[PDB]
Design a protein around this nucleic acid. Structure first.
Length: 290
DNA sequence: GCAACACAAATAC
DNA sequence: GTATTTGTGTTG
């Protein structure tokens, strides 16, 4: 009934079929590593502005809740939360040098203001976009929002155990413990080490995430999860790394900048999951039906 | 179909 | 021992 795999940090992922077994909402068995992501493609190259060297980038994503590996499929539930986290790394550039430098897109050169990640859900068979929704811990007693573009600096991806432990931290002391893992506070650096043109000082806010954490995410409540044939639809979750630029023929999305002008999230790399099945709200997807 | 409302069980403190 | 968080039962 429960299939167990050892995660890289020594935690376990425990895959069970919610049609055959109900587990408590807050059980650690609800936390598990989801499907691995694969490269879709690389898009616009990025180069350091004086040396001219190309920045070698890699998205590092993981799902830590909401998907089980059952009967050779990755399976999620429409009514339940999933968690998707990602960082990116720059193989040829250490963080401290990276934040002091400046980077252009090699399209003939747009300045990168900052790097950022966004997620999307798609119908994997036709590439149609599928709406995602997020809640706060308060769920219906709090606001719903759509996943947002998250400015990020490069960082290792925290272990599954760390994502787990930080999922519902209220206490102020425990927050301090995790702060350095999830955030870079720009206001706390020595300003005199940085040039006016440095990458770090073109990020939009002082609080910069090192890890994009999309928690309490759900497929929109209106998505059809089956085809007309009653076969299950196949969905996929995508992580896109972009460079935000000021636009004053390559793939990009428009973004509402801080100053209010229209910017461009210019695509740099994209990864995605293998096909995913999502089980709808029907009683037959649940063990209580039996 | 689905929003809103309900119950319950383990975590966080 | 209390409040919170979240899977999932029920309603109309």
């Amino acid at each position: 009934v429960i299939l167990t795999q050892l995660n890289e940090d020594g935690t376990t992922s425990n895959y069970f079929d919610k049609r055959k077994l109900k587990i408590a909402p807050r059980s650690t068995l609800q936390f598990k590593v989801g499907p691995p992501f694969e490269l879709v493609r690389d898009y616009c190259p990025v180069v350091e502005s004086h040396t001219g060297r190309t920045l070698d980038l890699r998205i590092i994503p993981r799902i830590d809740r909401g998907f089980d590996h059952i009967d050779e499929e990755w399976v999620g539930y429409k009514r339940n939360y999933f968690t998707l986290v990602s960082t990116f790394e720059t193989a040829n550039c250490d963080l401290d040098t990276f934040l002091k430098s400046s980077f252009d897109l090699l399209v003939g050169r747009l300045r990168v203001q900052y790097f950022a990640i966004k997620i999307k859900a798609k119908n994997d068979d036709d590439d149609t976009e599928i709406n995602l929704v997020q809640h706060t811990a308060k769920r219906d007693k709090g606001p719903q929002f759509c996943p947002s573009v998250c400015p990020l600096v490069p960082s290792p991806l925290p272990k599954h155990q760390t994502i787990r432990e930080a999922s519902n931290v209220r206490n102020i002391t425990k927050m301090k413990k995790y702060d350095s893992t999830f955030y870079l506070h720009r206001d706390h650096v020595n300003y005199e080490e940085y040039g006016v043109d440095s990458l770090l000082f073109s990020y939009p806010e002082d609080s910069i995430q090192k890890v994009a954490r999309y928690e309490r995410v759900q497929f929109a409540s209106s998505i059809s999860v089956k085809k007309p044939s009653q076969q299950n639809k196949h969905f996929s979750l995508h992580v896109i790394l972009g460079a935000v630029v000021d636009p004053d023929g390559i793939p990009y999305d428009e973004l509402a900048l801080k100053n209010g002008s229209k910017g461009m999230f210019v695509y740099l790399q994209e990864m995605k999951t293998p096909p995913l099945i999502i089980r709808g709200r029907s009683p037959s997807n649940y063990a209580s039906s039996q």
